[PDB]
Design an enzyme around this catalytic site. Structure first.
Site, PDB file in Angstrom:
ATOM      1  N   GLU A  14       5.651   3.487   4.505  1.00  0.00           N
ATOM      2  CA  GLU A  14       5.944   4.765   3.910  1.00  0.00           C
ATOM      3  C   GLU A  14       7.302   4.701   3.211  1.00  0.00           C
ATOM      4  O   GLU A  14       7.555   5.331   2.190  1.00  0.00           O
ATOM      5  CB  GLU A  14       5.830   5.844   5.002  1.00  0.00           C
ATOM      6  CG  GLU A  14       4.432   5.952   5.692  1.00  0.00           C
ATOM      7  CD  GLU A  14       3.839   4.686   6.417  1.00  0.00           C
ATOM      8  OE1 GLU A  14       4.585   3.944   7.224  1.00  0.00           O
ATOM      9  OE2 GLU A  14       2.558   4.440   6.197  1.00  0.00           O
ATOM     10  N   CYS A  23       9.588  -2.708  -0.524  1.00  0.00           N
ATOM     11  CA  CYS A  23       8.262  -3.263  -0.531  1.00  0.00           C
ATOM     12  C   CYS A  23       8.236  -4.763  -0.314  1.00  0.00           C
ATOM     13  O   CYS A  23       9.146  -5.474  -0.674  1.00  0.00           O
ATOM     14  CB  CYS A  23       7.563  -2.909  -1.834  1.00  0.00           C
ATOM     15  SG  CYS A  23       7.384  -1.116  -2.103  1.00  0.00           S
TER      16      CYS A  23
END
Length: 156
Positions: A14, A23
């Protein structure tokens, strides 16, 4: 094995959705075509499903290629964070324009010698995406470096 401090740096899926600097390496591919040909991107749900697997793969990178089993937990956890974010291959070699080839990174050289301070101090060598320097990656690397060095140097 990654410790709590390392896991704060890695964050969660999230967190990748809101801050794409968080990421995993494999999704830092948007818009970089030159081919290979374009391919569809990953969904958020796939990123979430693979998150733990990708932490494992990062730990395996450090163990297999950086003497991870011989590191203290803080260095191991910092290095795992870097491998999660940047990918194993990027931490192992880089392309030297001056020499016309792929060469060993300094961070890998020092890890292979068990020189963890020197290894840690090379974390900020990895601040590029697709050859483009990024402030968010510099910040990340510096925070990993401070974790990495904790216990390895004079605390005061």
């Amino acid at each position: 094995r990654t410790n709590q401090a390392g896991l704060e740096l890695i964050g969660n899926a999230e967190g990748c959705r809101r801050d794409p600097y968080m990421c995993p390496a494999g999704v830092w591919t948007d818009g970089i075509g030159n081919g290979v040909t374009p391919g569809v991107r990953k969904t958020d749900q796939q990123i979430a499903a693979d998150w733990e697997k990708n932490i494992l793969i990062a730990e395996r990178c450090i163990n297999q290629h950086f003497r991870g089993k011989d590191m203290p937990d803080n260095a191991f956890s910092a290095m795992t964070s870097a491998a999660f974010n940047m990918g194993c291959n990027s931490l192992r070699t880089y392309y030297s324009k001056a020499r016309g080839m792929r060469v060993e990174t300094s961070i890998h050289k020092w890890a292979q010698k068990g020189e963890w301070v020197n290894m840690c101090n090379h974390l900020p060598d990895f601040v590029n995406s697709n050859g483009v320097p990024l402030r968010g990656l510099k910040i990340r690397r510096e925070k990993e470096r401070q974790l990495c060095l904790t216990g390895l140097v004079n605390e005061h």
